Scaffold this active site. Structure first.
Site, PDB file in Angstrom:
ATOM      1  N   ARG A   1      46.176  42.350  20.712  1.00 24.43           N
ATOM      2  CA  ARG A   1      46.869  42.989  21.837  1.00 24.43           C
ATOM      3  C   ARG A   1      46.483  44.694  21.657  1.00 24.43           C
ATOM      4  NH1 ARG A   1      51.602  45.251  24.264  1.00 24.43           N
ATOM      5  NH2 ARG A   1      52.151  44.859  21.436  1.00 24.43           N
TER       6      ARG A   1
ATOM      7  N   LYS B   1      53.672  42.731  32.782  1.00 24.38           N
ATOM      8  CA  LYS B   1      53.805  42.539  33.718  1.00 24.38           C
ATOM      9  C   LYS B   1      54.692  42.459  34.420  1.00 24.38           C
ATOM     10  CE  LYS B   1      52.067  38.515  35.880  1.00 24.38           C
ATOM     11  NZ  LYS B   1      51.287  38.103  36.777  1.00 24.38           N
TER      12      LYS B   1
ATOM     13  N   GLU C   1      44.413  35.720  34.474  1.00 20.53           N
ATOM     14  CA  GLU C   1      44.524  34.923  36.015  1.00 20.53           C
ATOM     15  C   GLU C   1      44.612  36.065  36.730  1.00 20.53           C
ATOM     16  OE1 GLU C   1      48.662  34.149  33.856  1.00 20.53           O
ATOM     17  OE2 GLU C   1      47.734  32.027  32.846  1.00 20.53           O
TER      18      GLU C   1
END
Ligand SMILES: [Cl-]
Length: 537
Positions: free
Chosen positions: A253, A263, A32
């Site tokens: 991950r 984040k 994104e």
């Protein structure tokens, strides 16, 4: 040869390719554009583009940009910068949001077939009903009424959050996610890429499959059901191809010790001022790591070395530092600088001389040399001098002699003090200890680095350490209280002058200190500033 560790996914792709299930492999990397990438994202990058090049296929860089509030072009640019920095070459650069029309069309089709409906209920009622596994009252609206509302939504007649399009699946489904999940929402906000055309935007779960499908992706790789439902109900509509269809597969991950990746936490470190900015070498962003001095090859190596699996063991930072060290070892010429300078005067030496000193240790094939200046005044590391030395003490002290690296042996004569701490050494060369041992047989127990105070260049040194003292700060409590207050120490030291005739992207090993390079932002030829990429073991 093969770039991506033998693992579940290579064998799988190899199978499908050989058996002919897809002609070309087609992967994508979908970040994104609402932030900077980090060492975690490297795994998804190496894997997805790695896969493409290993098997003569294609890989799309795609911005999954369906969240108009946070997403900006600089984040996209920055992403592409970092992907290409790691050495990878997207087959195409694409923006989910360029497929917005096709997606909206594919929604009409759903509403037409009675597979989706507008929901007037407020968010908090929707989730309470979902938790009860009961249906929205609005669930069984006619096709016509739904199209008309959705259309009114499109026109921006309703405000942000007020209405949603949802799949009609099963509200009493054992899987929560399948309880009539949301396909479209309303945001009265402009998109950075496509501007003000839209006021209704698809959710992840609806847009992702469609962006894959539109691109003819074959293998969709994401980290650890609605996806399938979207494909199976749309295969062959809106002129999307009837087959083949993409298939999701999942890897773990990357969770690196002594580092946070979430984040929200990273946001707290920047905004909090605990770190100077997004490219701060203290940070595990790709930006920061680039500016630190890590080479993209080491990150890619790190990523390979650690493998791809469902195995979510926390990776030790030791490993990373270990890889960065091995990465730099064949290519970092060795020079001498001093970080915590203590002056040393030589009482029995005059003038100057220049020594041919070798850049490379015996065991690196490379040859290479530089004139290294010697003189009666030097700096050594304050820490290489003890008035009261321990039993194993290999460096300078009152009894002991010491090897100046590439130069003479010296022994201490006088120490001069002021404020009760140590301000200058008076010492003497043991002649002719240059290139040889001392006549008397008593060799120095050790070798220390040094520079000539008559020739050296000032440097601002940025000694970077790990950002956290605790192994698992990300899940540990007050992660702020776990910061390593040694994460950055700035010292004003000196380096040998040779470095002035090096291209600016040279990375050195400063002997007995660690690896370093000119900080690409701040350093200037007339005011050097060098980051320590990583210490030695
Ligand atoms: Cl030596």
């Amino acid at each position: 040869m093969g770039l991506v560790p033998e693992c579940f996914i290579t064998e799988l792709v190899e199978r499908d390719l050989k058996e002919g299930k897809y002609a070309k492999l087609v992967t994508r990397f979908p970040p994104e554009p609402n932030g900077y990438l980090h060492i975690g994202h490297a795994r998804s990058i190496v894997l997805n583009f790695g896969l493409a090049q290993d098997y003569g296929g294609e890989c799309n860089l795609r911005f999954d940009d369906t969240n108009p509030e946070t997403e900006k072009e600089e984040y996209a640019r920055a992403i592409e910068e970092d992907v290409r920095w790691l050495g990878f070459r997207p087959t195409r650069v694409l923006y989910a949001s360029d497929y917005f029309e096709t997606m909206y069309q594919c929604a009409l089709v759903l509403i037409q077939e009675g597979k989706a409906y507008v929901d007037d209920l407020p968010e908090e009622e929707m989730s309470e009903l979902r938790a009860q596994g009961k249906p929205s009252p609005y669930r069984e609206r006619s096709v016509e009424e739904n199209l008309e509302l959705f259309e009114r939504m499109r026109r921006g007649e309703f405000p942000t959050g007020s209405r949603v399009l949802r799949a009609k699946i099963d509200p009493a489904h054992p899987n929560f996610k399948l309880r009539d999940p949301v396909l479209y929402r309303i945001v009265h906000a402009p998109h950075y890429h496509v501007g003000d055309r839209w006021v209704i935007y698809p959710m992840y779960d609806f847009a992702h499959p469609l962006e894959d499908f539109i691109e003819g992706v074959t293998h969709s790789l994401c980290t650890l059901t609605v996806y399938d439902w979207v494909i199976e109900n749309l295969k062959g509509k809106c002129g999307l191809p009837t087959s083949p269809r993409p298939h999701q597969y999942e890897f773990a991950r990357l969770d690196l010790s002594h580092t946070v990746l979430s984040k929200r936490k990273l946001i707290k470190l920047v905004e909090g001022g605990y770190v100077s900015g997004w490219d701060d070498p203290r940070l595990p962003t790709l930006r920061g790591l680039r500016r630190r001095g890590v080479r993209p090859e080491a990150i890619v190596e790190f990523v390979r070395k650690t493998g791809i699996s469902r195995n979510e063991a926390q990776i030790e930072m030791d490993l990373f530092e270990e890889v960065v060290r091995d990465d730099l070892n064949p290519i970092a010429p060795r020079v001498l600088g001093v970080v915590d300078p203590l002056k040393v005067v030589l009482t029995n030496y005059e003038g100057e001389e220049w020594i041919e000193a070798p850049y490379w240790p015996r065991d690196i094939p490379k040859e290479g040399t530089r004139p290294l200046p010697f003189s009666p005044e030097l700096y050594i590391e304050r820490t290489d001098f003890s008035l009261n030395p321990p039993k194993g003490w290999k460096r300078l002290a009152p009894g002991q002699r010491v090897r100046l690296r590439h130069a003479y042996v010296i022994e201490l004569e006088d120490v001069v003090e002021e404020g009760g701490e140590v301000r200058l050494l008076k010492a003497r060369i043991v002649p002719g200890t240059l290139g040889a041992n001392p006549e008397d047989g008593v060799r120095p127990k050790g070798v220390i680095h040094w520079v000539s105070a008559r020739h050296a260049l000032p440097v601002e040194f940025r000694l970077y350490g790990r950002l956290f003292r605790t192994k698992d700060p990300e899940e540990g409590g007050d992660f702020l209280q776990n910061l390593n207050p040694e994460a950055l120490v700035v010292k004003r030291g000196f380096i040998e002058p040779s470095v002035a005739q090096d291209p600016e992207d040279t990375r050195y090993q400063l002997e007995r200190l660690g690896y370093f390079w000119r900080d690409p932002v701040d350093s200037r030829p007339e005011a050097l500033v060098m980051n320590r990429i990583v210490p030695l073991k």
